[PDB]
Amino acid sequence: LSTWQTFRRLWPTIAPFKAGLIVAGIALILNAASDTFMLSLLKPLLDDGFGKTDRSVLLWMPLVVIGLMILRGITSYISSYCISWVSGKVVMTMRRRLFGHMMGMPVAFFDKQSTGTLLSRITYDSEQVASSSSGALITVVREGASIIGLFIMMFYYSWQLSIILVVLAPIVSIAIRVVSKRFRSISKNMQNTMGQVTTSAEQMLKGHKEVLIFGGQEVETKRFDKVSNKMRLQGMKMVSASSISDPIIQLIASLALAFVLYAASFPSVMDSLTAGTITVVFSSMIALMRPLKSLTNVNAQFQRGMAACQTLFAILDSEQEKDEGKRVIDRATGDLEFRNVTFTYPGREVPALRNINLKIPAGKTVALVGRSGSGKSTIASLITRFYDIDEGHILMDGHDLREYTLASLRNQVALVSQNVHLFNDTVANNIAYARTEEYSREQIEEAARMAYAMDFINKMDNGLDTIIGENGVLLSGGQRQRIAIARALLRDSPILILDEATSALDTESERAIQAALDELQKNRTSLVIAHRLSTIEQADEIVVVEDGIIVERGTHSELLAQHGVYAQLHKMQFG
Amino acid sequence: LSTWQTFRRLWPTIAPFKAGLIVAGIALILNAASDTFMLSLLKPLLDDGFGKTDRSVLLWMPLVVIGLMILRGITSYISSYCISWVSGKVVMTMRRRLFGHMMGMPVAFFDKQSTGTLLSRITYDSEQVASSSSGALITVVREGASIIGLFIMMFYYSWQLSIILVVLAPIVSIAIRVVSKRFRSISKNMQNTMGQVTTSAEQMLKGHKEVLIFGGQEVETKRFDKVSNKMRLQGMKMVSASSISDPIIQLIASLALAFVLYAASFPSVMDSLTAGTITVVFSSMIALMRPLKSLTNVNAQFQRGMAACQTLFAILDSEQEKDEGKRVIDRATGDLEFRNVTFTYPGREVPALRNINLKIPAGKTVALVGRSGSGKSTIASLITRFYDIDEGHILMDGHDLREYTLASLRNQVALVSQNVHLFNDTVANNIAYARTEEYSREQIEEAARMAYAMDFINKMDNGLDTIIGENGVLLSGGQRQRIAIARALLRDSPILILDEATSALDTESERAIQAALDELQKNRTSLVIAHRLSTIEQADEIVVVEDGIIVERGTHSELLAQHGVYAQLHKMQFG
């Protein structure tokens, strides 16, 4: 209905690759001509050949057959290659645009659904877009050409007979539609009263025990004999009706045939005719049925493919992360403060955090501590503006976070976890995620040294050049952790978020990990979702979170002496 | 493989209705001839008509068209009617035999599965039996006839060209199979390495938050640009391969065509030919493809339908209730005794009853009492031999139950419940379930009187003649109960099992129910799965069951004084 809006929108991504469409359409028209020329040459076969018993006709005829067929194959390959090339580039451009758009959507959008199955729906629907629309272009250009061809040829070789057929065919098809509809109604009326009798009969084996006790078996057999005969007689009523439809339909079309032959008896018609031209006109008229049937499904196909293009424009039209921030931080000095921070995850009520006051001074390290839920993680995600807050403020160097540009803000923070973003590349270029040409191999080796990683790197194929496979296959949890540390070390990020909740703590050479973490925290601001005793007790401040509110605050022994929830968690070792 | 065993087994149920098959086959052969005669008359059309410009040919030709088509419709209707009649009677006979067999199977068989969905599987599989096998008979007789016809006609009108086509066709089809197999392999090798690259690309939007923090968006966009271009270029690799197959296949068949034409150039061939005979031989050779393709699916269809006939013979071959009992009781005097009865439900371990000793003397009434599980119901079902026992004995008139014939034994017992077997009939003939002509309306009215039923029966359309609808629509729980009572009253059954566990006890005119129950129990043996206080306290003996063993036994106050489990249940009012 409105799918040409969708198409007019889509078009300027295609219009760069127009040439291949031009070409494809040409080759399709050629392919249609080649078809109808092959049909056309039944006339010389039956006249110039067998009518004049001229065996020279059957000599060239083979060479025109294999000729045309060679051309038809060539035109087919050209057309399907041009079409595939254009649809491939259109889907690739649309996939790239969609991806670049999503990389820049809210994290909310990313927490509704797995990206693994969103990019599956997207690659599939983009394929179905270019598939359905190019298939419709094909069957338009080609079946339109072949229809025009067969009509021209029909009327040329015998406009009288062609006018007869063109008139008869609609009447015959409308007579058939009318008859098979009148029979669909009669079949659904009988399937209703067959469904009832069948249900009735499928019930009457129940209450078997009552029957055995009372000895009513022969009675229930005489009830089934009757319902079975009734089922079978309804089966007959249905068959005798349905097996009449198709005889009458064929007799209807046969009357049209016999009528066409009777018309061809009259010389007004017969003088234009021969064996050749009659068989050409019947062949081309039968050949018309396929491209017409194709042409009445083209609309369904085109809208089916603009329906999938609707979803991709839906995704491209949904809104990106807010970045009205106007200030650019070179390097944050460090002082970082929550001030009455209240926050609700979108699409819920019951806040996740209430009235969070909290100051992390420059150089210092706060440890967040609490049970599973708590809100530990939410605070950290609020640091990077992965969401935005309902009430209060969060300050960096005495300005709100939202006054800074998302890029500047996120350039200051770094993150360390076990589930660090590893990807198919060298170690060197993982450690320098972006900024590969901005840090030399010397610097990257120093970052890997102080992260206690050259231990296991130098014991590996090509050292720092060693590739890390599909998803980062090779590295164990503690190696992941040390790589993440090397990364946060290499960029001298003024803030550090350290997530210990995911990372595992059995790991051989946890000593090395703590030694690197120690070197990392050195004179840099660091919020820590904490579970290592080692870092909790060493923390300049601790902040205890319960049900989204800070309950306790202070140093390790200061809070332990209070025998409160911090003590409860220290006894359980956090977990 | 062994499906002709199944068929030879099935055959003598069909052989009664052989006539209709004979007829159907005849009409099918006629229908095939009518077809090939219509094809045959292209030769006079193009020769005797347009070759000699004889317009008289095109005068009779219409009348032979509509002639043959009338005959073809008639033969089609005759054949499909005979076939439907035979398959209908075969499925009905098989359904009746299956039903009569199941009515007489163990109750175990009835407790595995709902009979409502077993008789659905049975009516469906019987339909699929006669459907598949008659469809295969049809397409055998008919497509075999039409094949013979078109072959005869082809070789008659030009054995030279026919020998050419008969030789070429297999070679061409084997060349096509070989080519499209060599292309299936090449397409599956490319779909494997497309599946890998697609999975790789659907992963790489994960870890979004890590990316935002580290600001690695442009890096991941440059990783997607590359994996997207790689996907698209594999799309090309796949298309350029698959869109070559069909051109080569067509060029292969075109070479066969051109070869046939070249052979038709040589006069050894061409002198037998005309326009008429060449178009007849090509028409009949194309017409051969459909019945051949049908004939290579007939085997699959026949075994598909003997597979469904396998399940029905499976059901008919499974074993019926054991009835080696040799003794016939006219009327049981009443004395009924369990003696160390242990019993396990088949397909479990942990017996349901252990060492059940219990005597119900003539005229007396025992009340079984206990919690939900207990085994109350099992004892009753063991009374009628709905199962058989592992250890001990159950005696009626001082002989084991298994010495009596199942029919004689069950003639002595009667049953009263709420879920009584009601069915589509008059009230009178429900009350006299079997034995409708053995009890007069006078007797049945007396039975309904003393069951306190003429209350609500005389207040109804036609009184005792009132029909009870689909499943027994009209009657409320208490009316059901009183009808069941009237039934057990009418047959003067020496034993009575009364199931109160299912029947509901709020019911207005429970007074009437207890009054009827009182009239029923009068001087007849009665085991009662008891929950009415009224009958529990009045019971000559009570038997308390817990975890499949009798724990307490004795009169109402005798057991209540013991403050045991009977007291616990009397306090809860049984429920």
Beta-carbon contacts of B75 under 8 Å, excluding residues fewer than 6 positions away, are: B27, B28, B30, B31, B34
β-strand pairing of B353-360 with B336-343: antiparallel
Q: Looking at the structure, do residues A359 and A419 belong to the same domain, yes or no?
A: yes
Which CATH number does the domain housing residue B74 bear? 1.20.1560.10
CA distance A41 to A24: 26
Assess contact for B78 and B23: CB atoms under 8 A. Answer: yes
Contacts of B411 in chain A (CB under 8 A): 215
Residues spanned by the domain of A250:
3-317
Residue B435 is assigned to a structural domain of this protein: no
Helix B57-102 to helix B3-14 angle, to the nearest 10 degrees?
90
Buried-exposed string A136-171: b where 16+ CB fall within 10 A, e elsewhere: bbbbbbbbbbbbebbbebbeebbebbbebbeebbee
Contacts of A273 in chain B (CB under 8 A): 50
C-alpha distances out from residue A216 to A377, B109, B346, Å: 72, 18, 25
Q: Looking at the structure, do residues B126 and B266 belong to the same domain, yes or no?
A: yes
Distance of CA A59 to the CA centre of its chain: 56
SS3 (DSSP) at A22: helix
SS3 (DSSP) at B329: coil
C-alpha distances out from residue B100 to A220, A222, A249, B109, B424, Å: 9, 10, 44, 14, 20
Domain final position from B317, B352, B376: B317
Nearest by CB to residue B76, choosing from A96, A247, A487, is A247
Buried-exposed string B483-494: b where 16+ CB fall within 10 A, e elsewhere: bbbbbbbbbebb
Contacts of B59 in chain A (CB under 8 A): 262, 265
Assess contact for B140 and B295: CB atoms under 8 A. Answer: yes
Assess contact for A153 and A165: CB atoms under 8 A. Answer: no
Assess contact for B402 and B485: CB atoms under 8 A. Answer: no
Residue B486 is assigned to a structural domain of this protein: no
Assess contact for A62 and B62: CB atoms under 8 A. Answer: no
Assess contact for A40 and A280: CB atoms under 8 A. Answer: yes
Are B55 and A92 in contact (CB < 8 Å)?
A: no
Q: Searching chain A, which residue's CA lies closest to the CA of residue B92?
A: A228
Q: How many CA atoms lie within 13 A of A141 on its CB side?
A: 20
Residue B101 is assigned to a structural domain of this protein: yes
Q: Which residue of A72, A205, A415, A492 is the best one to mutate when testing the B interface, meaning the one whose CB has the most B CBs within 10 A?
A: A205
Nearest by CB to residue B414, choosing from A58, A66, A214, is A214
CA distance A566 to A559: 6
CA distance A426 to B500: 79
Contacts of A236 in chain B (CB under 8 A): 84-85, 88
Nearest to A266 by CA among A169, A164, A166, A168: A164
Nearest to A142 by CA among A291, A297, A302, A293: A291
Q: Which residue of B97, B209, B409, B491 is the best one to mutate when testing the A interface, meaning the one whose CB has the most A CBs within 10 A?
A: B209
Q: Searching chain A, which residue's CA lies closest to the CA of residue B64?
A: A258
Are A421 and B262 in contact (CB < 8 Å)?
A: no
Name the one residue in this structure whose structure tokens are 């249905």. A238
Assess contact for B350 and B375: CB atoms under 8 A. Answer: no
**B213, two tokens:** 């923090």
Residue B467 is assigned to a structural domain of this protein: no
Q: List the beta bridge partners of residue A359.
A: A337
Nearest by CB to residue A107, choosing from B47, B208, B386, is B208
Q: Looking at the structure, do residues B338 and B306 belong to the same domain, yes or no?
A: no
CA distance B39 to B123: 41
**H-only helix segments in A491-551:** 510-521, 533-538
Q: Looking at the structure, do residues A310 and A350 belong to the same domain, yes or no?
A: no
Beta-carbon contacts of A574 under 8 Å, excluding residues fewer than 6 positions away, are: A369, A530, A531, A533, A536
Residue B490 is assigned to a structural domain of this protein: no
Q: Looking at the structure, do residues B247 and B372 belong to the same domain, yes or no?
A: no
Amino acid, single-letter form, for residue A87 = S
Which DSSP letter does residue B531 get?
-
Shortest Cα distance from A549 to chain B (angstroms)? 24
Nearest to A121 by CA among A113, A131, A132: A113
Q: Which residue of B66, B172, B205 is the best one to mutate when testing the A interface, meaning the one whose CB has the most A CBs within 10 A?
A: B205
First and final C-alpha spacing in chain B: 58
C-alpha distances out from residue A249 to A178, A212, A288, B142, Å: 10, 54, 20, 20
Residue B575 is assigned to a structural domain of this protein: yes
* DSSP annotation string for A149-209: HHHHHHHHHHHHHHHHHHHHHHHHHHHHHHHHHHHHHHHHHHHHHHHHHHHHHHHTT--HH
Helix A115-203 to helix A217-265 angle, to the nearest 10 degrees?
110
Are B88 and A232 in contact (CB < 8 Å)?
A: yes
CA distance A539 to A532: 11
Phi-psi region of B355 (alpha: psi -120 to 50; beta: other; left: phi over 0): left
Nearest to B27 by CA among B82, B65, B67, B68: B82
CA distance B479 to A80: 77
Nearest to B212 by CA among A411, A332, A333: A411
Are B212 and A386 in contact (CB < 8 Å)?
A: yes
Phi-psi region of A392 (alpha: psi -120 to 50; beta: other; left: phi over 0): left
**Reduced 3-state DSSP string for A1-16:** CCHHHHHHHHHHHHHH
Nearest by CB to residue B202, choosing from A76, A120, A205, is A120
Q: How many CA atoms lie within 13 A of B138 on its CB side?
A: 21
Q: Searching chain A, which residue's CA lies closest to the CA of residue B255?
A: A66
Method: X-ray
Contacts of B58 in chain A (CB under 8 A): 261-262, 264-265, 270
Q: Looking at the structure, do residues B343 and B310 belong to the same domain, yes or no?
A: no
SS3 (DSSP) at B550: strand
Residue A140 is assigned to a structural domain of this protein: yes
Chains A & B: contacts with CB separation below 8 Å: 330
Nearest by CB to residue A433, choosing from B65, B100, B219, is B219
Q: Which residue of A265, A322, A438, A481 is the best one to mutate when testing the B interface, meaning the one whose CB has the most B CBs within 10 A?
A: A265
Are B99 and A407 in contact (CB < 8 Å)?
A: no
Q: Looking at the structure, do residues B101 and B125 belong to the same domain, yes or no?
A: yes
Q: Looking at the structure, do residues B388 and B253 belong to the same domain, yes or no?
A: no
Phi-psi region of B476 (alpha: psi -120 to 50; beta: other; left: phi over 0): beta
How many C-beta atoms surround the C-beta of residue A339 within 10 A?
15
Assess contact for B516 and B480: CB atoms under 8 A. Answer: no
Q: Looking at the structure, do residues B164 and B212 belong to the same domain, yes or no?
A: yes
Which DSSP letter does residue A319 get?
P
Which H or E run includes B472?
Answer: none
Sign of CA dihedral B43, B44, B48, B54: negative
CA distance B292 to A575: 73
CA distance A497 to A365: 10
Contacts of B116 in chain A (CB under 8 A): 202-203, 205-206
Domain final position from B272, B287, B317: B317
Backbone angles phi, psi at A522, to 5 degrees: -40, 105
Are B72 and A208 in contact (CB < 8 Å)?
A: no
Number of domains in chain A: 2
Contacts of B195 in chain A (CB under 8 A): none
Q: How many CA atoms lie within 13 A of A289 on its CB side?
A: 8
Are A59 and B407 in contact (CB < 8 Å)?
A: no
Assess contact for B228 and B201: CB atoms under 8 A. Answer: yes
Beta-carbon contacts of B305 under 8 Å, excluding residues fewer than 6 positions away, are: B128, B129, B130, B131, B132, B133, B136
Buried-exposed string A409-440: b where 16+ CB fall within 10 A, e elsewhere: bbbbbbbbbbbbbbbbbbbbbbbbbbeeeebe
Which DSSP letter does residue A551 get?
E
CA distance A19 to B549: 90
Shortest Cα distance from B203 to chain A (angstroms)? 5
Name the one residue in this structure whose structure tokens are 């442009």. B218
Domain final position from A288, A317, A346: A317
Name the one residue in this structure whose structure tokens are 């089916």. A304
Q: Looking at the structure, do residues B119 and B8 belong to the same domain, yes or no?
A: yes
C-alpha distances out from residue A467 to A442, A451, B228, Å: 18, 19, 21
Longest dimension (CA), chain A: 120
Which H or E run includes B423?
Answer: none
Shortest Cα distance from B561 to chain A (angstroms)? 37
Q: Looking at the structure, do residues B238 and B302 belong to the same domain, yes or no?
A: yes
Assess contact for B264 and B168: CB atoms under 8 A. Answer: no
Amino acid, single-letter form, for residue A454 = M
**Reduced 3-state DSSP string for B262-325:** HHHHCHHHHCCCCHHHHHHHHHHHHHHHHHHHHHCCHHHHHHHHHHHHHHHHHHHHCCCCCCCC
SS3 (DSSP) at A461: coil
Q: Searching chain A, which residue's CA lies closest to the CA of residue B384?
A: A213
Q: Looking at the structure, do residues B114 and B43 belong to the same domain, yes or no?
A: yes
Nearest to A14 by CA among A91, A74, A81, A82: A91
Contacts of B63 in chain A (CB under 8 A): 258
**H-only helix segments in B394-509:** 406-412, 427-431, 441-450, 454-457, 477-490
Q: Which residue of A31, A96, A103 is the best one to mutate when testing the B interface, meaning the one whose CB has the most B CBs within 10 A?
A: A103
Which CATH number does the domain housing residue A467 bear? 3.40.50.300
Contacts of A206 in chain B (CB under 8 A): 114-116
β-strand pairing of B467-468 with B425-426: antiparallel
Are B119 and A419 in contact (CB < 8 Å)?
A: no
**A434, two tokens:** 């972006």
Are A46 and B279 in contact (CB < 8 Å)?
A: yes
Contacts of B96 in chain A (CB under 8 A): 221, 224-225, 228
Assess contact for A46 and A274: CB atoms under 8 A. Answer: yes
Residue B428 is assigned to a structural domain of this protein: no
